[PDB]
Amino acid sequence: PLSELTISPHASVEVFRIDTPIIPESRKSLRVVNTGLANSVTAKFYWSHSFTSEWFESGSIDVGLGEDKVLNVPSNSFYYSKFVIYNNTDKVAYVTANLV
Ligand code: NA
Ligand code: NA
Ligand code: NA
């Protein structure tokens, strides 16, 4: 799966939520390419389970302008997962995101 994403200044975008609520499964990693203009974006992996209101952070990478990096994910099986990519800058981020 691949997505061309526009991430507005001081904003985040949630991508690739995957629900496997009965039988948990390991998850694919996320390849992130930051093409600018934002000097960096931070991609994080989140997971949850059926009896909580929270998502839990487990893993993070920073991707600078011009960088092509994979955010690794845990070896664990999960019931619910998603990624959040954060643009903590005043410039728009044009990024690509795909599962690998
Ligand atoms: Na906001
Ligand atoms: Na809930
Ligand atoms: Na991770």
Domain spans, the chain:
1-100
CB 65 within 8 A of CB 40: yes
Output the CA 47–ligand 2 centroid distance in Å: 12
CB atoms within 10 A of CB 61: 16
Distance 76 CA to ligand 2 centre (A): 20
Q: Give this entry's resolution in angstroms.
A: 1.6
Q: How far apart are CA 52 and CA 73, in angstroms?
A: 21
Contact assessment for residue 67 and residue 55, using Cβ atoms and an 8 Å cutoff: no
Give the phi and the psi of residue 32 in degrees, each rounded to 5: -120, 130
Backbone angles phi, psi at 48, to 5 degrees: -150, -175
Distance (Å) from CA 90 to ligand 3 centroid? 26
Alpha helices in the chain (DSSP H): none
Cα-to-centroid distance, 40 and ligand 2 (Å) = 31
| Cis geometry, peptide bond prior to residue 37 (ω within 30 degrees of 0) | yes
Q: How far is the CA of 1 from the centre of ligand 3 (A)?
A: 18
